[PDB]
């Protein structure tokens, strides 16, 4: 009983690099040590040793899994003070990372080229690029803890709000960091299995509702980390194909759970992301959501009241110039193997946006103009 | 602490060396120590001497002994102190002659020729060189490939190769005649993966300005010096019969020729050697060879801008989903079949060191772009009404995967490169296909790799140049009457007798009833319609009605 917390006490006071060693095997047998329900005495005690795990980092998986049935005797305050931990436990990692990742470039700068030079040729030629061992190795041990966590938040279950306040916003504010610096295609995963694991926990229904509106924080995490992503560098594909099924699920539940003025606004917002992108991508879809994006962004502000004129008016004239532009099919071979199969996908993605079919150039033009928006229209662009 | 007595002391504790080595849990570091010491006592010049000749031999033996006992590969700190080693006892050998052999001169007490063959002796020399260049081998094999540790030891290949040119200027003919074919081995080795710096450093480098000078044509003959004993070489593989060697040796050749010659040379050779029926039964690492060979043929093929020459010499390989494997970079699963991992130990232990690597993602590159080049205008002639040659599997299906994507956009991965030139070649913009293919190999860091970058980027611009001009002549003789030659000079960026070769060709060999004037650079040809092409679509539809019914009488009868 206080024995734990006076050798607590001394493994800490004592330490060396040998004995760290031996504190990692006890930490590992102290994690089952009493079996009692945590009140007064066993928080204080438990804290104290967990902030000493923190800092040894002793074996990663297992003091998470021991935390993932610890934390479950109702113990609130300790959850959300661990997530307060999970930002530090990863982010002294990207500043012990940046301590090397700087400290290498400045010996780059004082060591020679022209004594280097062949091997450097030599390392071009090969491609084995500019690499470097000790920001890679630290690289990977908190993207360990990073994906734990998100394990966790799957296994946490029912109230989960200490992860659904915090966690997903400091998830989300860590991947792009991660992002930028370099793991971009662990990103492109991590956000394809948090999606399985999303639609998965929506699926258990284990005390757990639209109600308390449990839904719209994982799903505003997932819809700002794949926009930033998308925006930044990614492959096209594979960032669409699960954004779509989350919009299918979004769309059921606010069909469901009666259409929500605040989403539907950051879905508008989201919507003018996608507008952009498939200008570059796809212009038939384009139309489509520019069209849904002027639809809602319309009944937002019949619901809502939006006094922003000057902004409504450069966005009513953006739309309007913006809308009829759709080229005709160039791609040969995909009219030798078959259109109607990018026709099929055209028409069930664009039913999942919500407009049915794709909208054809001239009633494009024609249903655009017969919209008392056309009066709202700017002098010089409605004169053009 | 030896013992403190002449001579035969010191050849009593060699043989007990010998004979505790061969017995399983001796103290190997303790017998170094004891070799190391009885090397310290020695003084006297000849037998002394000798001594510790007979030692420093067995010196690197025992520390080739000792790593097996406990890890791994050779560790990096003994085979530096090898390295050194072999340095010294290389540098004691050049300063003897053949002191201590005996060679009867002096017999009390000498004798390399009893215990015994002096030229045993002198070529077991090189063997013991071998057990470092099997070791440094090993490290490079199984170092990391982005580790700073690689780039390190890589700078140790030099100190390698300034020993096997030691050892070259050793020999003494009856050592040269018999090890030459391990030799020209070596000579591969620090030869098979050389890069174009060197060869254009030589070449290119103004003689009227550069070296004059006594030491420069000692070294840059040097260099130059494979070259000439790989030409040797061959007439003397002439004598021998280890096939697998003269395989392997060839390939290399095609691969010294084509990269740091003329690639003529390269063609000639493998069109002489004809080695098929070789490495089917000359082992996988020829087979690795031929492989490594082949790449290397078709981007020397693509380095001189032959579309169809360099998407040949690639074929082989890109029929092929298991150029990952080749490399070592196999999984145990990924597709069904990848087992067991007890035989891939073996395989990963022989496949393959990261500075003996070429990049498969560029292969495919150089693959993509050389059949895109003469696939997208033979789509555009066949079907807009020329369709007679369709081939069942080609560009079109490595096309398709990306081609069917309803969702992309800009690109970020090589393939969606590949995909969005192919999206620019259909529309014909040449600028446009030029900006996609220079741009994004600049921004990937693959340009960089050779010093004929711009010679190879003009050439694939000429290229798209013509077959623009290809494409554009084939979708617009939809509805061109008539056309001038001046316009398509101008707007495609060509001087008159290349747009005149470009239209020339076209008429004469796809065999086009249109009327070329030449002298008053003007064509003719009101080729039209919409009606006639759904007429030849249904003619064609209509011929493979009539062939499959006199297919069906030959099933029948």
Redesign the interface.
Same mark, same amino acid.
């Given at each position: 009983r206080p024995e734990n917390a006076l050798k607590r006490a001394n493994e800490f006071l004592e330490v060396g690099k040998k004995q760290p060693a031996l504190d990692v095997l006890y930490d590992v047998m102290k994690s089952k040590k009493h079996r009692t329900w945590q009140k007064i005495h066993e928080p204080i005690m438990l804290k104290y040793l967990e902030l000493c795990v923190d800092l040894r980092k002793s074996h990663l998986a297992k003091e998470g899994l021991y935390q993932y049935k610890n934390i479950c005797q109702q113990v609130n305050i300790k959850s959300l003070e661990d997530v307060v931990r999970a930002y530090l436990k990863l982010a002294e990692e990207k500043t012990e990372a940046a301590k090397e990742e700087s400290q290498q470039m400045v010996l780059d700068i004082e060591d020679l080229d022209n004594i280097q030079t062949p091997?450097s040729?030599?390392?071009?030629?090969?491609?084995?690029?500019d690499?470097?061992?000790r920001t890679?190795r630290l690289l990977l041990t908190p993207w360990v803890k990073f994906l734990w966590e998100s394990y966790r938040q799957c296994l946490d279950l029912l109230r989960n709000n200490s992860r659904v306040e915090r966690l997903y916003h400091d998830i989300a504010q860590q991947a792009f960091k991660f992002c930028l610096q370099y793991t971009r295609k662990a990103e492109f995963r991590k956000l394809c299995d948090n999606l399985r694991m999303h639609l998965s926990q929506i699926q258990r229904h284990h005390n757990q509702s639209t109600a308390i509106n449990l839904n719209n924080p994982e799903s505003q995490s997932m819809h700002l980390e794949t926009r930033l992503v998308q925006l930044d560098?990614? &492959?096209?594909?594979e960032l669409?194909?699960e954004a779509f099924k989350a919009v299918e699920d979004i769309h059921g539940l606010f069909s469901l759970s009666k259409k929500p003025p605040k989403p539907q606004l950051m879905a508008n917002y989201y919507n003018k992301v996608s507008t952009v992108?498939?200008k570059?991508?796809?212009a038939l879809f384009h139309a489509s959501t520019l069209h849904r994006l002027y639809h809602l962004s319309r009944e937002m502000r019949k619901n809502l009241t939006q006094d922003e004129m000057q902004r409504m008016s450069t966005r009513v004239l953006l739309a309007t110039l913006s809308i009829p532009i759709t080229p005709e099919r160039?791609? &040969?071979?995909?009219l030798?193997?078959m259109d109607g &199969? &990018?026709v099929e996908?055209?028409r069930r993605?664009a039913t999942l946006l919500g407009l049915q079919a794709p909208p054809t150039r001239i009633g494009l033009i024609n249903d655009m103009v017969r919209f008392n928006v056309l009066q709202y229209v700017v002098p010089e662009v409605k004169d053009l | 602490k030896g013992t403190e007595i002449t001579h035969a002391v010191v050849i009593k504790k060699l043989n007990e060396i010998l004979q505790a080595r061969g017995k399983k849990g001796t103290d190997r570091a303790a017998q170094i120590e004891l070799l190391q010491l009885l090397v310290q006592i020695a003084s006297e010049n000849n037998l002394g001497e000798g001594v510790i000749v007979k030692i420093k031999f067995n010196i690197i033996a025992s520390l080739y002994d000792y790593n097996p006992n406990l890890a791994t590969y050779m560790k990096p700190e003994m085979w530096q102190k090898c390295l050194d080693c072999i340095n010294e006892l290389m540098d004691i050998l050049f300063a003897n002659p053949n002191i201590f052999v005996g060679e009867n001169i002096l017999e009390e007490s000498e004798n390399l020729q009893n215990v015994d063959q002096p030229l045993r002796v002198r070529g077991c020399i090189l063997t013991l060189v071998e057990r470092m260049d099997e070791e440094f081998t090993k490290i490079m094999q199984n170092t990391?490939?982005?580790?700073?540790?690689?780039?390190e030891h890589?700078?140790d290949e030099a100190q390698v190769c300034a020993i096997i040119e030691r050892v070259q200027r050793y020999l003494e003919e009856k050592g040269t005649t018999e090890e030459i074919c391990r030799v020209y081995l070596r000579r591969i080795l620090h030869t098979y993966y050389k890069?174009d710096?060197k060869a254009h450093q030589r070449q290119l480098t103004p003689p009227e300005g550069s070296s004059k000078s006594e030491q420069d044509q000692a070294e840059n003959e040097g260099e130059d010096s494979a070259v000439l004993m790989e030409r040797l070489c061959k007439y003397i593989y002439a004598k021998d019969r280890t096939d697998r060697i003269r395989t392997c040796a060839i390939l290399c050749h095609i691969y010294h020729h084509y990269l740091h010659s003329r690639w003529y040379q390269a063609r000639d050779l493998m069109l002489m050697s004809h080695l098929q029926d070789n490495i089917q039964h000359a082992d996988p690492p020829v087979q690795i060879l031929y492989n490594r060979t082949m790449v290397q043929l078709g981007i020397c093929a693509f380095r001189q801008g032959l579309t169809k020459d360099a998407h040949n010499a690639l074929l082989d390989i890109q029929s092929s989903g298991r150029a990952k494997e080749l490399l070592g970079q196999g999984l145990l699963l990924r597709s069904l079949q990848e087992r067991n991992q007890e035989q891939e130990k073996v395989e990963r232990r022989r496949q393959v060191p990261?500075?003996l690597?070429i990049?498969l993602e560029l292969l495919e590159c150089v693959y993509l772009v050389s059949a895109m080049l003469l696939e997208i205008p033979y789509?555009?002639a066949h079907?807009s009404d020329a369709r007679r040659r369709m081939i069942s599997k080609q560009f079109?299906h490595q096309?398709?995967v990306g081609?069917?994507?309803?969702?992309?956009?800009?690109?970020?991965?090589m393939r969606?490169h590949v995909v969005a030139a192919?999206?620019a070649m259909?529309?014909g913009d040449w600028k446009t296909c030029h900006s996609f293919i220079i741009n994004e190999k600049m921004n990937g860091?693959v340009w960089?790799?050779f010093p004929e970058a711009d010679k190879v980027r003009t050439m694939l611009v000429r290229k798209i140049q013509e077959e623009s001009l290809r494409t554009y002549l084939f979708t617009y003789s939809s509805v061109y009457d008539s056309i001038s030659m001046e316009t398509l000079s101008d707007m495609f960026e060509l001087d008159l007798p290349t747009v005149h070769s470009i239209i020339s060709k076209m008429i004469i060999n796809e065999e086009l009833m249109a009327s070329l004037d030449q002298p008053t650079q003007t064509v003719v040809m009101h080729r039209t319609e919409p009606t006639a092409q759904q007429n030849l679509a249904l003619q064609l539809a209509e011929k493979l009605g009539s062939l499959v019914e006199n297919n069906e009488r030959v099933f029948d009868h």
């Open positions: 091997e040729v030599l390392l071009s030629a090969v491609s084995g690029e690499t470097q061992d890679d560098s990614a &492959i096209s594909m669409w194909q992108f498939w570059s991508g796809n160039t791609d &040969i071979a995909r030798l193997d &199969i &990018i996908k055209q993605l | 990391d490939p982005h580790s700073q540790e690689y780039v890589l700078k890069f710096y990261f500075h690597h990049n789509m555009a079907e079109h096309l398709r081609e069917r994507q309803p969702l992309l956009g800009p690109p970020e991965s969606e192919s999206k259909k529309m860091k960089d790799l």
